[PDB]
From TrEMBL, chain B:
Species of the source: Toxoplasma gondii (strain ATCC 50853 / GT1)
Name recorded for this polypeptide: CHCH domain-containing protein
Disulphide-bridged cysteine pairs: C8-C40, C49-C78
From TrEMBL, chain C:
Superkingdom of the source species: Eukaryota
Range within the parent protein: 105 to 156 of 208
The protein's name in its UniProt record: Putative myosin heavy chain
Automatic annotation (TrEMBL), chain E:
Keyword Signal: yes
Keyword vocabulary terms for this entry: Signal
Signal sequence, start to end: 1-25
Parent-protein start and end of this portion: 2 to 76 of 92
Protein name in UniProt: Transmembrane protein
TrEMBL record, chain F:
Positions of the ATPTG10-like domain: 4-101
Residues of the full protein shown: 15 to 122 of 138
Organism name: Toxoplasma gondii (strain ATCC 50853 / GT1)
Domain of life: Eukaryota
Name recorded for this polypeptide: ATPTG10-like domain-containing protein
């Protein structure tokens, strides 16, 4: 009795699940070959990024022992990146399988203390990257909930966009890096909140008369702005 | 006296209705109701903000440089059900102060009941210097006033 | 009616600060308060049948 | 030709992906949903109503708010069944043995 | 007369001196609108009018930004809520 | 001795391969997958017309499972994708009508 | 321009006064509505007030 007879059609019919498998098993059904994803991009550890940090490009220090070999983003990518899907794009900034800095705690109180001091979250350390489908599902659920909360709100799509950008930047495993990208939509939402409030509660101000040189040149048109 | 309580509540509603119908410009027409409302107050231990509203109306047509702020806050604090939380201390002192009732001190983020003067300070070189020195002492920054380069001139402060 | 609007606004502000979008009861609470806003100019007897 | 997509253009890449031989319905990508809170919320609501765990599990039903169904499965029913029969008989359509049905379906769906 | 070196001035003149009547007309229209606004203000208004502002939609049932007034269904003892 | 499990896992692998080959622009590989996608299963063939006419709780269970496995909406114009989706749904329908699914975490 | 500027200065002074008073009246209106709501709420307080020593809802044992 053999194990898994009808379960390896990929092997029976030389069907590669990816160019890496194609190159390995020598099926040669990918016309464009394969450019291997190097190990520094397949795995690695979290690193400091800012140039205004002294330990820049150095691995992040944790209470537990950690391999300090870092994930290197793709800084000099090739001109042709035939697969421009999220699957192949995410590997340039994160490792699909997650970082290699996860702990195996010898006890429960060590885990407790790390969490209590803000140095561990399983959501952040024991996890992979999110697939495009998962990101879209989360975004659409959040959008439905926001619409149900209030349809006649102006900052709705702004909140949805900051959520979307966090999910796309993988804030679960890179919260600081993702906030660095989403704080702009947060700020726009703040502005829209003030604007909606001032439109609801009539808030206006006495505008001063028009300046003597409002137009730089007499022949120039003074486009009227509300 | 629940009958009397209901009667006076109806009277107060009628007074409000007449005052709204007349407007805050013509408010001297509804003086008829004071006779009964003051008796209501003296009987039921209740208040109705009569003098406060009248003073506010009178002031907002001939306003004060303060723009009737004290009248506004007085009316706002008097219309409260359980009584005013914030008051203006009656004092022989020249500058009056804003005081907070003790029974409501636990609702406000304060150490004492004195919330400061009810008028802004007067411009004074001495007070400015005092505040600046206090801030410098609290900061304790070695490097304040240091001038690495100054335009060479017979004048001590070139420009300024 | 103005005081009813104010009371409903207070309820909504309090409940929205209390319950976040991840909370399950947020949508039902907001829906009930929206029904109240819709039925302000009514009596409790007529509002119950609609908001129950 | 296919240039790198920076990390700032990924939100638009998710809802407007590039063209591929097997594209999704971009107009329907905002409609793909799969609620992870369905059964927890159902149980919470029922237990708050006052039912027991067994009653809740008997009354539970799968989520209907999922990704909509393809209208082709109802419009091109007969053609799809015929194509599947052809495939089952001809080993998956090797060396273009179901081109007939596949092209009929493609024409019906595309119309030039 | 003219010359190639005067192309700047020729173009500027040809395109601008015909606009001076329209500029003067715009100025006169602005003056008349200001006059009418001031006459209306003198006549009287429920809510104030901002003179140098583009549009003033405020009335008894409309905020100073075009939205309905909140808490305006009933009546108030001190009169208008504004 | 485990044909259902084997063919399920194989079909999943082939769907993944089709998606990858589409992303990498490989018609040869994706057609190889489509051809290898187990079209000669009598049980699924017999359940196909049953699924095409089912309705109600069974259909909702099967659609929930198919959204769990393949939530992305296929293009309404690609007959190959449509057919692979139909085949996977028919397989799930056969498994369900033999032994129904229990999708709730709460159960006993 | 000087005549217009004098007239505008007077008008702007009056307008500033009116705007301040109007905003403060709006503030007062809102605060009075809040006071009415509070007066109606205080009727729902049980006789003797609240028992601020214990929790309103006891939602578990203490063994
Ligand atoms: C040969 C021609 C004639 C030569 C002589 C001309 C110079 C006459 C002036 C002499 C006075 C100099 C003062 C000396 C005391 C020290 C102060 C000082 O010097 O600092 C000034 C300055 C440095 O200042 P600083 O470092 O910034 O520090 C303090 C500030 O200066 C000052 O502090 P502040 O910033 O707070 O002050 C601000 C404000 C203070 O002042 C003011 O506010 C107003 C001052 C203006 C007063 C106007 C007059 C008032 C009139 C009232 C009456 C009106 C009615 C009657 C008149 C009617 C008129 C018709 O502005 C000024 O400072 C004005 C200063 C002007 C400097 C002199 C400019 C001339 C440069 C040299 C020109 C060389 C020409 C070619 C030579 C050719 C030789 C081959 O240094 C110089 O000016 C150097 C002067 C050198 C003279 C050289 C003469 C030629 C010698 C050739 C040697 C060969 C080698 C040379 C190399 C090239 C070879 C080819
Ligand atoms: C010891 C003797 C002292 C003599 C004192 C003489 C005092 C003379 C004071 C005149 C001051 C006029 O000041 C100037 O006038 C014009 C109109 O008149 C104003 O108005 C001008 O600018 C403002 C906007 O910029 C608008 O009103 C308008 O666009 C224009 O008319 C200017 O805003 C003001 O800066
Ligand atoms: C027969 C009508 C009168 C014919 C003569 C018209 C001459 C008008 C040109 C004078 C210069 C006007 O230049 C500028 O335009 C208008 C006034 O016109 C003013 O504009 C400002 O005050 C006017 C009040 O009238 C407001 O309507 C306007 O919202 C405000 O921006 C500026 O303060 C002034 O600096």
């Amino acid at each position: 009795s053999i194990l898994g007879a009808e379960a390896f059609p990929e092997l029976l019919s030389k069907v590669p699940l990816n160019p890496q498998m194609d190159e390995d098993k020598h099926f040669n059904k990918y016309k464009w070959g394969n450019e291997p994803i190097p190990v520094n991009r397949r795995t690695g550890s979290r690193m400091n990024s800012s140039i205004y940090d002294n330990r820049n490009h150095e691995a992040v220090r944790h209470p537990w022992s950690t391999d300090a070999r870092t994930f290197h983003p793709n800084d000099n990518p090739e001109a042709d990146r035939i697969n421009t899907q999220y699957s192949n794009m995410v590997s340039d900034s994160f490792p699909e399988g997650g970082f290699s800095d996860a702990p195996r705690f010898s006890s429960n109180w060590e885990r407790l203390l790390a969490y209590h001091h803000g140095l561990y979250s399983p959501e952040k350390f024991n996890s992979t990257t999110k697939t495009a489908d998962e990101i879209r599902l989360a975004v659409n659920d959040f959008a439905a909930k926001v619409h149900a909360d209030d349809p006649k709100n102006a900052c709705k799509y702004l909140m949805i966009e900051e959520f979307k950008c966090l999910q796309s930047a993988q804030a679960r495993i890179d919260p600081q890096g993702a906030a660095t990208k989403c704080v702009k939509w947060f700020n726009e939402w703040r502005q829209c909140a003030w604007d909606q409030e001032k439109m609801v509660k009539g808030y206006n101000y006495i505008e001063d008369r028009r300046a003597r040189k409002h137009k730089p040149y007499i022949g120039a048109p003074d486009l009227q702005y509300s | 006296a629940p009958h009397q309580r209901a009667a006076c509540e109806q009277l107060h509603s009628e007074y409000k209705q007449c005052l709204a119908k007349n407007g805050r410009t013509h408010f001297s027409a509804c003086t008829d109701f004071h006779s009964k409302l003051r008796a209501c107050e003296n009987m039921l231990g209740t208040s109705y903000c009569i003098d406060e509203g009248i003073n506010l109306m009178k002031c907002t047509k001939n306003p004060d440089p303060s723009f009737c702020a004290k009248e506004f806050v007085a009316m706002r604090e008097c219309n409260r059900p359980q009584g005013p939380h914030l008051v203006l201390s009656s004092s022989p002192s020249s500058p009056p102060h804003y005081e907070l009732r003790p029974e409501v001190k636990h609702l406000y983020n304060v150490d004492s009941t004195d919330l400061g003067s009810a008028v802004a300070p007067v411009r004074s070189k001495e007070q400015l210097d005092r505040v600046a020195d206090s801030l410098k002492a609290d900061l304790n920054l070695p490097g304040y006033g240091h001038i690495p380069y100054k335009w060479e001139s017979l004048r001590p402060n070139p420009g300024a | 009616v103005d005081a009813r609007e104010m009371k409903v606004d207070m309820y909504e502000k309090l409940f929205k600060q209390a319950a976040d979008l991840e909370n399950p009861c947020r949508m039902p609470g907001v829906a009930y308060l929206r029904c109240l806003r819709d039925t302000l100019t009514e009596t409790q007897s007529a509002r119950r049948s609609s908001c129950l | 030709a296919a240039s790198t997509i920076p990390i700032s253009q990924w939100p638009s890449l998710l809802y407007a992906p590039p063209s591929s031989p097997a594209n999704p319905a971009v107009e329907a990508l905002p409609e793909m949903q799969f609620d992870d809170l369905h059964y927890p919320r159902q149980m919470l609501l029922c237990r708050g109503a006052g039912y027991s765990l067994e009653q809740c599990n008997r009354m539970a039903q799968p989520d209907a708010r999922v990704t909509p169904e393809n209208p082709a499965e109802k419009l091109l029913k007969e053609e799809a069944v015929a194509a599947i029969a052809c495939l089952s008989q001809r080993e998956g359509g090797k060396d273009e043995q179901c081109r007939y049905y596949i092209e009929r379906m493609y024409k019906l769906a595309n119309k030039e | 007369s003219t010359s190639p070196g005067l192309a700047f001035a020729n173009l500027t003149l040809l395109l601008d001196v015909p606009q001076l009547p329209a500029i003067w007309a715009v100025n006169a229209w602005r003056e008349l609108n200001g006059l009418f606004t001031e006459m209306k203000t003198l006549a009287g208004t429920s809510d104030l009018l901002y003179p140098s502002n583009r549009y003033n939609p405020q009335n008894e049932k409309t905020n100073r930004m075009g939205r309905p007034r909140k808490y305006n269904h009933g009546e108030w003892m001190f009169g208008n809520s504004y | 001795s485990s044909p259902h499990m084997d063919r399920l896992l194989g079909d999943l692998k082939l769907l993944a391969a089709y998606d990858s080959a589409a992303g990498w622009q490989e018609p040869k590989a994706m057609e190889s997958a489509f051809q290898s996608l187990s079209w000669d299963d009598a049980d699924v063939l017999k359940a196909l017309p049953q699924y095409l006419n089912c309705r109600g709780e069974q259909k909702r269970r099967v659609d929930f499972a198919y959204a769990a496995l393949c939530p992305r909406p296929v293009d309404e114009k690609d007959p190959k994708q449509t057919l692979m989706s139909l085949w996977m749904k028919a397989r799930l329908f056969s498994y369900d009508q033999k032994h129904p699914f229990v999708l709730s975490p709460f159960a006993a | 321009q000087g005549i217009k500027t004098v007239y505008a200065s007077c008008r702007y002074r009056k307008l500033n006064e009116r705007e301040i008073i109007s905003d403060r009246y709006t503030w007062l209106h809102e605060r009075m509505l809040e006071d009415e709501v509070e007066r109606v709420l205080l009727e729902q307080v049980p006789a003797g007030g609240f028992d601020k020593t214990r929790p309103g809802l006891l939602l578990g044992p203490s063994t």
